[PDB]
Amino acid sequence: RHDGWQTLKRFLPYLWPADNAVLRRRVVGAILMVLLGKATTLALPFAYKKAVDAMTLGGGAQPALTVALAFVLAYALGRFSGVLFDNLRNIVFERVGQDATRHLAENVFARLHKLSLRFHLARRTGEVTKVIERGTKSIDTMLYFLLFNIAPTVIELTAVIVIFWLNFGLGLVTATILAVIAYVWTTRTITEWRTHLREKMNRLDGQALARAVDSLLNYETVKYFGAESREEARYASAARAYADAAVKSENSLGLLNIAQALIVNLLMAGAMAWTVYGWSQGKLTVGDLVFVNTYLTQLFRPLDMLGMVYRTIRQGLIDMAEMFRLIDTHIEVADVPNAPALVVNRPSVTFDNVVFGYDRDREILHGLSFEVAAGSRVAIVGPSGAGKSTIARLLFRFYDPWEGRILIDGQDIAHVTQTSLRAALGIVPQDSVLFNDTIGYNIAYGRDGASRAEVDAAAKGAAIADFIARLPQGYDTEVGERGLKLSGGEKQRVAIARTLVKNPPILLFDEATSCLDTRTEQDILSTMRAVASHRTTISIAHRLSTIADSDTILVLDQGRLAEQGSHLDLLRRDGLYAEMWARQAA
Amino acid sequence: RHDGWQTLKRFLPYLWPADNAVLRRRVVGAILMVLLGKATTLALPFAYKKAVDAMTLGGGAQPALTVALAFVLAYALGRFSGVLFDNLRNIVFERVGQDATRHLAENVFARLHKLSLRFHLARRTGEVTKVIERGTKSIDTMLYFLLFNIAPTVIELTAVIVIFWLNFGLGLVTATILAVIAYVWTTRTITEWRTHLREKMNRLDGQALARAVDSLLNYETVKYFGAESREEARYASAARAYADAAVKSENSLGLLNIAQALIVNLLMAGAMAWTVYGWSQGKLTVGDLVFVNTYLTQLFRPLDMLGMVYRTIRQGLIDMAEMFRLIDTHIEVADVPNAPALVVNRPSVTFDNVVFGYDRDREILHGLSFEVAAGSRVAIVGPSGAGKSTIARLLFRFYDPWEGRILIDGQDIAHVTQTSLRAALGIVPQDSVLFNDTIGYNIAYGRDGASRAEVDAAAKGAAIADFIARLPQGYDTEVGERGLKLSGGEKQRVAIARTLVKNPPILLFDEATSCLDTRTEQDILSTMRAVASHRTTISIAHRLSTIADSDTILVLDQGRLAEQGSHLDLLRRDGLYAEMWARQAA
Numbered sequence A, B: 001r002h003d004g005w006q007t008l009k010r011f012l013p014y015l016w017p018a019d020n021a022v023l024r025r026r027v028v029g030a031i032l033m034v035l036l037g038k039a040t041t042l043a044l045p046f047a048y049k050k051a052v053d054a055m056t057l058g059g060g061a062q063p064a065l066t067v068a069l070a071f072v073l074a075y076a077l078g079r080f081s082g083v084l085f086d087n088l089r090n091i092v093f094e095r096v097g098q099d100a101t102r103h104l105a106e107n108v109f110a111r112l113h114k115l116s117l118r119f120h121l122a123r124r125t126g127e128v129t130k131v132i133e134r135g136t137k138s139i140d141t142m143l144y145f146l147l148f149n150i151a152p153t154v155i156e157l158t159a160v161i162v163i164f165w166l167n168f169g170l171g172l173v174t175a176t177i178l179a180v181i182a183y184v185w186t187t188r189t190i191t192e193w194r195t196h197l198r199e200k201m202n203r204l205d206g207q208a209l210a211r212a213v214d215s216l217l218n219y220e221t222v223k224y225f226g227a228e229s230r231e232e233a234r235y236a237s238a239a240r241a242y243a244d245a246a247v248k249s250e251n252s253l254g255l256l257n258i259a260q261a262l263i264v265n266l267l268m269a270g271a272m273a274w275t276v277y278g279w280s281q282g283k284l285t286v287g288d289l290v291f292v293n294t295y296l297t298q299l300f301r302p303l304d305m306l307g308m309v310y311r312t313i314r315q316g317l318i319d320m321a322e323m324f325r326l327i328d329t330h331i332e333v334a335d336v337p338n339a340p341a342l343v344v345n346r347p348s349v350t351f352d353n354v355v356f357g358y359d360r361d362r363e364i365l366h367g368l369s370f371e372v373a374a375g376s377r378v379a380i381v382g383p384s385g386a387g388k389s390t391i392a393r394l395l396f397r398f399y400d401p402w403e404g405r406i407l408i409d410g411q412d413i414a415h416v417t418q419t420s421l422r423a424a425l426g427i428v429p430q431d432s433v434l435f436n437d438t439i440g441y442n443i444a445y446g447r448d449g450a451s452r453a454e455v456d457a458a459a460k461g462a463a464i465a466d467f468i469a470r471l472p473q474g475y476d477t478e479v480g481e482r483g484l485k486l487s488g489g490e491k492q493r494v495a496i497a498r499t500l501v502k503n504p505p506i507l508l509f510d511e512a513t514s515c516l517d518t519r520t521e522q523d524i525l526s527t528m529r530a531v532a533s534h535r536t537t538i539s540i541a542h543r544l545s546t547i548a549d550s551d552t553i554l555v556l557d558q559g560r561l562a563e564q565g566s567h568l569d570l571l572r573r574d575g576l577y578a579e580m581w582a583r584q585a586a
Ligand SMILES: Nc1ncnc2c1ncn2[C@@H]1O[C@H](COP(=O)(O)OP(=O)(O)O)[C@@H](O)[C@H]1O
Pocket: A120, A358, A364, A382, A383, A384, A385, A386, A387, A388, A389, A390, A391
């Protein structure tokens, strides 16, 4: 049983790359700068003590000031050299720190892309925004505070213990040890209490800000129902709660600082009083008193932030463990063990006794079996909740069937590589998304090495090349958010051009026209009929009139195949498809 | 320059609430605690200097050991009392600070709700989240640093100048003043340079995080086209750019700290050398050396944060000026001074020669005039660019016509109060949004004092009460984002129930069923026909079959009224409406 250390040890390869010489040399130089700065900050109070002694004794300077002048100049130069070494170590190590955190983030990103519905379960705007906005900052803060506050403070504490032992290590060493122990214990307990209060304050702040954002984003609704006063009172109550929580949190912070100062000042009083008492017996000089003062101040100056340091290090460790846990996530999606590549020569589709559900307590597909001939035009229709979008998702193997299988060209898609499987399939879903880039990039996204000629051919096949030609920047016009806005038909056409760039043998149109206007619907339906020239096409449409010209139609009811056949045959059977068509006919 | 001064002058009423009591006593107590803490931190180095003097001389009315012990105990007690006074001032002032920031945020929110057009111009995704998350933070840090670091430092600097003059020579004062001036100047220049580099770093960080979020949110699309490697490389390039920018920023911070330490330690060397030189000539005592040391350290330790303080003060002033500008924003559509409340006795609608456009360079409504009789069921149809949603928006007076007007019950809507006008109108738009709360709240949002019984009646009239009854938590079920997800039909039903709770005499259905399924479409169309019992109803639909039963049909083309009449009459006319109906016949 062990954590924390384990986590830091897994992180250490990122800090210690063993692939970049320069970075290891920089880590060594940073440690050397740590040592130099600590040595200088320990040496300068000795210089101050010797200057004071020269002012109170005769020393080795005949005017006695020369030694004092030299030593006060040495004290000032030591302060400057300590700060210089600290900033030099920061400068040298910052590159290694940034590179380590960047590599960790890249690994987490690459693993996230491999997870496949670990997100479909949780894709809340708040969760995504919070995670992606916090991840790097938490680690940066934890790493910096740990490496450049705990280790330097530990080194300084050990060196101060040694020096304090050599020079009256009878009682002051015990006193400083007791003071450090009490300080750390009190800081830790009060910091845990303060972290509880801080979490409550942060929750209230998030609630108030979320209420404000929801109000401003729904301004149209507020005006529609005249709820300005109600929303104002709501936000005012939330802000009052947040203010009370913040007041209590800052009062707890004040108590923490008061206790810290009490401990520190008790140690200072004891040490200085004991030192001057020893001076009265002639044991020690006054420079020893100033020495003790400066040593204690230099020791406890980093510990002033100790509560914040502890809290931030804890949070960073938690978040780093979270990142490693995300990396150590099993991929339920595909087995693909030594899988051979899928070779689609005749693009047929087979559903063999497919039984599937999202959760074990509810069941969707009760043994659905059907055949889609290669090159045929097939439609998939059904009422709400029929599960045809689940058919679309299972064809791409977003899930694996519990009891059944899916075949492409007669080959089970569960036994082939995901790359070859998804390379043979193109899909245009109901809600098509555009990347935040130029139209040229959005169209070329279909294939990696996509050339300009292929992009032009796809824009021509999607009947959108003329629309792009009329744009001022042409293919370099940025679309999506923070860019040029496109109509729903334009988004669907860009998606069609993307899938054409991909050029897959099998195509799925999942309610492509479900939210377009009738003119645009007819235009893009003609475009889709044109694009279905030499491909196997499956059109999952809600409106039956849009797919009446299909080679065959599959009617789904309650997750099973109720009816199959051509439009005229299904109408003549006077069944479920005929009932739906009759309802929609007028 | 002077904008920050005007900003602080505008803020001062919030900090010092002239017309307000008790919080002013809190402010006075906080200032008194500031004064006590500064006095104690100035007094303790005198105790240290006198302790050193007692240790270096052999005289004194009382035993040198007694006086030395008393003075070191006084020094420790002064340190403790200074920290105690600082924490007490923080605790006392936190209430006033939180209340002032809350009142500022409330005023900004209230003024933001009283603006109509500027929302659409500023709807960027990062825009809203960034401003809402950052405004209060910026104000808080700037206020804290100003009131508790700069002003105490100014008091301490004046007191240190006075004490150095009274107890030391004109030259120590001259040197410390020149050093403070050089420190401030260097800090200012380097902090401006650092703010430039830091802004570049933040922009690159935002770009990298936005790329990561866009990749992860479009995971389905990335899998559709097998672009995992491309997305990884894009994120890696963005992260490398961000890492380089961060490295340069932290190197600039190191340079700033190096310059600050150089100035401070040059002043320290000069002052200490001058003090020991004056002591060697008998001008000053040896305790004066430690006195000067402690005074300079206590003065310049808070100035270590001067760069961050300056940057935060600048950002807070900018953001506060921006908030005050938001409060001092002119309303486009403002009420007339003595506007009477709208009295709807006969809910007719009249558009007389309405000419309107969003921008003066483009024009949408080319003098549209029409009459909607009270209690009648009217439909408004047209192509995608006809501009009928602009009719819907102008009915609610989101804008004012350029040349023309709109009447409700014979009264110009531009001459009545906005509240009564919008209270007399209810609207169900195509994309209805839910507030982040329970369904009971989402339905009761129609009216302020909406009861649970009114919610039940509205859910019954919207044919959604049974759907809510089958939910486990019933009306207390949280819906919308970060909650239970509802289908488009369910959201439209909740919106209809909301408008029913409002119970307005005039209803507008703006393409409410354009994205619903057929069974839900028929159910919600029957619901709309039912709820139109004693109300004037205007149904703006693109699909003619959904509004064929309307009393009359208004056909819009190119922003003008092309055809008017009933469904049968317009079909008989064989015009534009007949052409659209024939095209849709399918
Ligand atoms: N992420 C999910 N978690 C749980 N249940 C789901 C999820 N997605 C879909 N379902 C359920 O599975 C069913 C699948 O039907 P669906 O494919 O949506 O039909 P259609 O394609 O006609 O809308 C739906 O009724 C829905 O209730």
